[PDB]
Structure 1
Amino acid sequence: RGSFVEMVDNLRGKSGQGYYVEMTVGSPPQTLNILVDTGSSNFAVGAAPHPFLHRYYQRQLSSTYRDLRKGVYVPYTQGKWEGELGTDLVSIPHGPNVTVRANIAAITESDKFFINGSNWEGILGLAYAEIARPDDSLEPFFDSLVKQTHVPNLFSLQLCGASVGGSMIIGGIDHSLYTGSLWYTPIRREWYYEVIIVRVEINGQDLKMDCKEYNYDKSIVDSGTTNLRLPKKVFEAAVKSIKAASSTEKFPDGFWLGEQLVCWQAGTTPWNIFPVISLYLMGEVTNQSFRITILPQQYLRPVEDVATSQDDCYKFAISQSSTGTVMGAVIMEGFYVVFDRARKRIGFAVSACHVHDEFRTAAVEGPFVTLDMEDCGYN
């Protein structure tokens, strides 16, 4: 129940292009690389020869393909996909030894969806039915997986920060992927992986904001987002505090707003000048919280694709949000994250693969006594 050597290192990717798992669709099996995405609920795959695609789902080749005779148009704030809904046989070669009949959205037109130069051709939406397109009757993949097999209602993600990697442990926890203890936060509601942030610290210095701001209008765990995204006010106070803590060196305003990169000579990054960032999360027990702490090496992420610079260039990967807090790859790269769906909870433990230096490490610590944690949730 605690060692899944088969599924260790089943995630690949490129920096800033996300984390993908190999998947097969149809009979005979068609291999596809699929973005692992805890911030959506559709299993959506390229099904037409978009020029950026390495491969695509060819329904005509699958004898087990069934048509639901229903389309879906999915817009985002920037970009879209449109698909045809059907079902087919789906398996995960480096996952559990099973085959599932799952909903597939066959992507027939898209815009700013696929990444030019990326090595994935679809998205595996791991969140719940409530946010599935077009509605909650379109059963997400993981629900079908759990319903149809004896795979436990749990998956865990170790996201390791040009090549990235890690593990998606399907049906369990691999103890070699973390150090110390897992600490669990409740899933507030089963739509996104919603959580409640209870306290925020920059280098141990509390932001002293009304904790309702931290979760305005929600906080989510999202492997499909690069940044730690913060509500506008929280971002402002956080940046003011990060500025103060790092005032040893001055940086342009546009860097903090993600409008410019900032570059240093190779190996000459002042990591120690930048603060740690701590998020206190609601614990399992009344008045009990725990704290997750990330490093500058999580939120100041390298931009390798700069043709106009011979130096080491970085993006400030904490940005403002109007959809609430998004604990993206910036958070998740620090931690082994257990999506304990059976128990409506998310476990955090320090990642065995997280990027750190000789002085500071990412941390998961508790218990702490935090009162009025329920007031932090926005209604």
Structure 2
Amino acid sequence: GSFVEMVDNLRGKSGQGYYVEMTVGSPPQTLNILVDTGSSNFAVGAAPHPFLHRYYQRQLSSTYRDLRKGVYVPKWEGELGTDLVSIPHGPNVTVRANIAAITESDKFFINGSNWEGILGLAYAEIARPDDSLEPFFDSLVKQTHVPNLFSLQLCGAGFPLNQSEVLASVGGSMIIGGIDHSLYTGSLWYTPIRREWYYEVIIVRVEINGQDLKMDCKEYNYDKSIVDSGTTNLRLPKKVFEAAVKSIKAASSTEKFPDGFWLGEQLVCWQAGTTPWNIFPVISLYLMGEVTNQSFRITILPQQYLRPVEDVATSQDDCYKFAISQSSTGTVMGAVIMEGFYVVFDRARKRIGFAVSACHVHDEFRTAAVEGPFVTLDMEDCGYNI
């Protein structure tokens, strides 16, 4: 591991998000910021809010610059400006970046998440108000010698973290500008970034316990497939969700679960330590490789797709919610999927790499996997075109 200063710089969990500490302004104002690969704005609470115990105070920053422009994101509303920004446990550089000062929000801030802002790591094409508002990471690369690449190791604990535990627990690593080899095992496999807006990829095959879901592969990427640390669940296009759940139910049929469970609404609980991991199937997603007609697969365990939640009775049972849900906006590889892997966002080579995470939760019989190569034909046809 060559980036020790950035290792273990994240805190949080799949349900409320993973955040990194940042400073804004002069003198520096410390804030916890949500790491979000599904958006492109750097936005921070800038006014009192029931869920914020701190916020950005523009009038206290000598380096604050007002852009005299508003921003609306449906929801949070803010005022645009720029100021000096740093990441304490990151590259030792300070950059001037766009900052949306959030003055009004509805259902944005999560009570107890411990984060006061969001760091949108995706491309300018999806930045608000428009693509002229340069994203933080673009500013970082243009102003310093930091390589145009970042990598994420999101670490789920595999069990419920209480309010004090989640504050004292290491939730992972965001390595800015590099790849740290201590964060993964095995090999890194790269899939093309299809287009630079969201981190868009193409899924070419889906298996549940080795059984091909057998759908037209365009179904898997309807209308797009993205990697999004700001989303908790693995989200799947309606028809793919329906087929995947049918197959997961069939594989786990030795136990009957209520419809509320499959809807991701209700928790299921087992006596402490008796969770029947083995009756649940592994899920494999085949991703387009960098070599023509070649793919690789990432395989996740139920330890990833069943999200630990504290029993409504705080009892000693191990409880979980089904963390796979339907989408009307395409496939979303959210935090529960990212928890199984070390994910490399190689902006410079327009590719995303996957490797088994050194912190993924597993059991003595099965482990998450990243394997390849596999011969796969017509993968360009798996992409969706409006």
1:8 aligns with 2:7: yes
Aligned to 1:164, the other structure's residue is in SS state coil
User: How many Å apart are 1:310 and its aligned residue?
Assistant: 5.3
Kindly indicate whether the alpha-carbon contact (under 8 Å) linking 1:15 and 1:164 is maintained by their aligned counterparts in 2: no
Kindly indicate whether the alpha-carbon contact (under 8 Å) linking 2:221 and 2:331 is maintained by their aligned counterparts in 1: yes
Cα distance, 1:305–1:44 mapped onto 2, change above 3 Å:
farther
Q: Work out the CA distance in 2 between the residues paired with 1:176 and 1:313.
A: 31
**TM-score between both structures, scaled by the size of structure 2:** 0.95
User: How many Å apart are 1:243 and its aligned residue?
Assistant: 0.5
User: How many Å apart are 1:254 and its aligned residue?
Assistant: 1.7
What corresponds to 1:318 in structure 2?
324
| Deviations 1:293-324, CA, capped at 9 Å, x for gaps | 00000000111262476532210000000010
| Deviations 1:309-355, CA, capped at 9 Å, x for gaps | 65322100000000100000121000000000000000000000110
What corresponds to 1:123 in structure 2?
118
Mean Cα displacement is larger for which, 369-378 or 14-23? Answer: 14-23
User: How many Å apart are 1:129 and its aligned residue?
Assistant: 0.2
Q: Work out the CA distance in 1 between the residues paired with 2:312 and 2:93.
A: 43
Mean Cα displacement is larger for which, 90-99 or 157-166? Answer: 157-166
Aligned to 2:310, the other structure's residue is in SS state coil
Q: Work out the CA distance in 2 between the residues paired with 1:254 and 1:14.
A: 23
Aligned to 1:88, the other structure's residue is in SS state strand
Cα distance, 1:15–1:220 mapped onto 2, change above 3 Å:
closer
Mean Cα displacement is larger for which, 132-141 or 250-259? Answer: 250-259
User: How many Å apart are 1:14 and its aligned residue?
Assistant: 4.0
Kindly indicate whether the alpha-carbon contact (under 8 Å) linking 1:184 and 1:347 is maintained by their aligned counterparts in 2: yes
Q: Work out the CA distance in 2 between the residues paired with 1:305 and 1:29.
A: 40
Kindly indicate whether the alpha-carbon contact (under 8 Å) linking 2:7 and 2:173 is maintained by their aligned counterparts in 1: yes
User: How many Å apart are 1:103 and its aligned residue?
Assistant: 0.3
Identity over aligned residues, as a percent?
100
Aligned to 2:170, the other structure's residue is in SS state strand
User: How many Å apart are 1:271 and its aligned residue?
Assistant: 0.3
Cα distance, 1:206–1:22 mapped onto 2, change above 3 Å:
same
Mean Cα displacement is larger for which, 255-264 or 287-296? Answer: 255-264
| Deviations 1:119-146, CA, capped at 9 Å, x for gaps | 1000000000000000000000000000
User: How many Å apart are 1:253 and its aligned residue?
Assistant: 1.5
Aligned to 2:220, the other structure's residue is in SS state helix
Mean Cα displacement is larger for which, 49-58 or 150-159? Answer: 49-58
| Deviations 1:15-68, CA, capped at 9 Å, x for gaps | 511100000000000000000000000000000010210210000000000000
Q: Work out the CA distance in 1 between the residues paired with 2:291 and 2:225.
A: 19
Q: Work out the CA distance in 2 between the residues paired with 1:129 and 1:98.
A: 22
Cα distance, 1:308–1:335 mapped onto 2, change above 3 Å:
closer
Kindly indicate whether the alpha-carbon contact (under 8 Å) linking 2:9 and 2:170 is maintained by their aligned counterparts in 1: no
Mean Cα displacement is larger for which, 357-366 or 307-316? Answer: 307-316
Cα distance, 1:15–1:338 mapped onto 2, change above 3 Å:
closer
Cα distance, 1:305–1:269 mapped onto 2, change above 3 Å:
closer
Q: How many residues align?
A: 374
C-alpha RMSD of the superposition: 1.1
Give the one of 82, 87, 96 matched to 2:91: 96
Q: Work out the CA distance in 2 between the residues paired with 1:88 and 1:20.
A: 20
Kindly indicate whether the alpha-carbon contact (under 8 Å) linking 1:54 and 1:120 is maintained by their aligned counterparts in 2: no
Aligned to 1:168, the other structure's residue is in SS state strand
**TM-score between both structures, scaled by the size of structure 1:** 0.97
In the alignment, structure 1 segments of 5+ residues that lack a partner are none
| Deviations 1:225-260, CA, capped at 9 Å, x for gaps | 110000000001100100010101111122111132
Q: Work out the CA distance in 2 between the residues paired with 1:359 and 1:310.
A: 24
In the alignment, structure 2 segments of 5+ residues that lack a partner are 158-168
